[PDB]
Write a protein that binds this ligand. Structure first.
Ligand SMILES: [Ca+2]
Ligand SMILES: [Zn+2]
Length: 197
């Protein structure tokens, strides 16, 4: 029943300029987010393993655009062309300081676990509160595992949970019962082999 997800976080150049080139500050920031999401996912019987953390200090390896949609596609393609031959992992997420146009702070492919160019997501480092950004990271990763937004009576001991269609500080860092169901149902039906090991 237990599944294991090997992940790689990719920090872009705008992120590096935002933290004034401070590599250790950026690592502390990402590590705390992983610590948070590891707990959220453990309740879904999925163990999160940080396989690697890549920081684009020199320059971006893809064109990061204001368009969240073009950025996700570029990142997924670079993942399949480059990253996968360097580090074995199951899913990769891009952390960027870019303000995407429209009301977009994150974007991911749906139900795409293990796919070379599609098991990826994109998230904007949108807040100074670490918990809120970590929640968005977990939210996009969940979209890769086939889960949809919470609605109606879905709950996590309160209604605003990770899969809420809007982020606020009233959002609890845990998944709702609906999220658990959809996620385990996807695992059941699609049984992505890369998260078995
Ligand atoms: Ca794996
Ligand atoms: Zn969403």
């Amino acid at each position: 029943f237990q599944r294991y997800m090997e992940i790689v976080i990719v920090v872009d150049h705008s992120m590096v300029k935002k933290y004034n080139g401070d590599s250790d500050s950026i690592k502390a920031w990402v590590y705390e987010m992983i610590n948070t999401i590891t707990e959220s996912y453990s309740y879904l019987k999925i163990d999160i393993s940080l396989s690697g953390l890549e920081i684009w200090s020199g320059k971006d390896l893809i064109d990061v655009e204001a368009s969240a949609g073009n950025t996700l596609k570029s990142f997924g393609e670079w993942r399949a062309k480059d990253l996968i031959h360097r580090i074995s992992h199951d899913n990769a997420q891009l952390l960027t300081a870019t303000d995407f146009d429209g009301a977009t702070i994150g974007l991911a492919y749906v139900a795409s676990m293990c796919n070379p160019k599609r098991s990826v997501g994109v998230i904007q480092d949108h807040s100074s509160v670490n918990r809120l950004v970590a929640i968005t990271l977990a939210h996009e990763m969940a979209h890769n595992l086939g889960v949809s937004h919470d609605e109606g009576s879905c709950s996590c001991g309160g209604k605003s949970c990770i899969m809420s269609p809007s982020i606020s500080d009233e959002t609890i860092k845990y998944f709702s019962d609906c999220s658990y169901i959809q996620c385990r149902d996807y695992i059941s039906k699609e049984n992505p082999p890369c998260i078995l090991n």
